[PDB]
């Protein structure tokens, strides 16, 4: 399996004391991958700025969130924060072009 052309790997360092990110969707729901609906201020992601509100996590630290439920994902991401081996979390987003008419 190739590296992955569709998508942009985003590295978020655990700068903040606690990661604060919100998502929605899930396999069950029309949306297969989780989409960022809210990005807490005191969260590594935000502090980074690289990421924005409205992204879609397709892969985290190598683990793909395909066919996974938002809940199952929340755990995957969190687990990446607990560990110490790495001082960051990989966030693969595509920034789908939802309703280009306006945005």
UniProtKB/Swiss-Prot annotation:
Subcellular location: Cytoplasm; Cell projection, Stereocilium; Cell projection, Growth cone; Photoreceptor inner segment
PDZ domain: residues covered: 9-92
Top-level taxon in the UniProt lineage: Eukaryota
Free-text function comment from the UniProt entry: Involved in hearing and vision as member of the USH2 complex. Necessary for elongation and maintenance of inner and outer hair cell stereocilia in the organ of Corti in the inner ear. Involved in the maintenance of the hair bundle ankle region, which connects stereocilia in cochlear hair cells of the inner ear. In retina photoreceptors, required for the maintenance of periciliary membrane complex that seems to play a role in regulating intracellular protein transport.
Disease: Deafness, autosomal recessive, 31: A form of non-syndromic sensorineural hearing loss. Sensorineural deafness results from damage to the neural receptors of the inner ear, the nerve pathways to the brain, or the area of the brain that receives sound information. Usher syndrome 2D: USH is a genetically heterogeneous condition characterized by the association of retinitis pigmentosa and sensorineural deafness. Age at onset and differences in auditory and vestibular function distinguish Usher syndrome type 1 (USH1), Usher syndrome type 2 (USH2) and Usher syndrome type 3 (USH3). USH2 is characterized by congenital mild hearing impairment with normal vestibular responses.
Quaternary structure note: Forms homooligomers. Interacts (via C-terminal PDZ domain) with MYO15A; this interaction is necessary for localization of WHRN to stereocilia tips. Interacts (via C-terminal PDZ domain) with MPP1/p55. Interacts with LRRC4C/NGL1. Interacts with MYO7A. Interacts with RPGR. Interacts with EPS8. Interacts with CASK. Interacts with CIB2. Component of USH2 complex, composed of ADGRV1, PDZD7, USH2A and WHRN. Interacts (via PDZ domains) with PDZD7; the interaction is direct. Interacts (via N-terminal PDZ domain) with USH2A (via cytoplasmic region). Interacts with ADGRV1/MASS1 (via cytoplasmic region).
Listed name of the protein: Whirlin
Species classification: Eukaryota, Metazoa, Chordata, Craniata, Vertebrata
First and last residues shown, out of full length: 815 to 904 of 907
């Amino acid at each position: 399996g190739s590296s992955g052309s569709s998508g942009t790997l985003v590295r978020v360092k655990k700068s903040a004391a606690t990661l604060g990110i919100a998502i929605e969707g899930g396999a069950n729901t029309r949306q297969p991958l989780p989409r960022i609906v809210t990005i807490q201020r005191g969260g590594s992601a935000h502090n980074c700025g690289q990421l924005k509100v409205g992204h879609v996590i397709l892969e985290v630290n190598g683990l793909t969130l395909r066919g996974k439920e938002h809940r199952e994902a929340a755990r995957i991401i969190a687990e990446a924060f607990k560990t110490k081996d790495r001082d960051y979390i990989d966030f693969l987003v595509t920034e789908f072009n939802s309703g280009p008419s306006s945005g």
